[PDB]
Amino acid sequence: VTRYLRLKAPFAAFRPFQSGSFRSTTPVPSFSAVYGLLLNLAGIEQRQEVEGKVTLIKPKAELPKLAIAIGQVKPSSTSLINQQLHNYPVGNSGKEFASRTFGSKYWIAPVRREVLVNLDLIIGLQSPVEFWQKLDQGLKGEDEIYPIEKPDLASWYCPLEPDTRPNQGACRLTLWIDRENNTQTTIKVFSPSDFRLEPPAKAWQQLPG
């Protein structure tokens, strides 16, 4: 890796991909979300932004190549703070609903979901010099994030093989997802490793995106 930078945030939420009627969350963000956040923070606009019923139709032909890991310093708890969020009905969709048709989003119904009390992340990116330079220009050029790479090292994550039973692992995770018919991502489960030493090469994952 070239260098890595640290950040923290008080509140966040990471929905499982089509969790269901009742939402849920995961202790750590997905790799795809982190990749998108880093791409946007550099000021790189999305490669494709066509419009229609849906979006996110992304070929890999023109897209930066890069390798990302993930880290974690302090465990955080979870809470549930919501009572309502409307939806789009399935069924008759009778009476007025069919009468209005104004970007409908009618039939408000109650539903709850989860939030994270606190969040802090440490990992950065292994990338060529030009990409890091333009990322710095996007951050500084024409909540809070800053590089403390060498000190302040904490635990990390890594894919797990059928041995060495881990503790408090993440149930599911996403690598590269497109909102269409596909095979989604291959590996789901991940395992945390606790040691104040540089993460192993297995922790680094070369992202296809």
Place this chain on the structure above:
RNA sequence: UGAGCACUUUAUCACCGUGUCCCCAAUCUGGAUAUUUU
């Protein structure tokens, strides 16, 4: 500052009461000597 991203936990109201007591008090004890110049 980008893609899953909505539209509210929403609107009202008394604890009624009433009601407190009488009795009382002790004692004893004291002291000694001492001034002179403008």
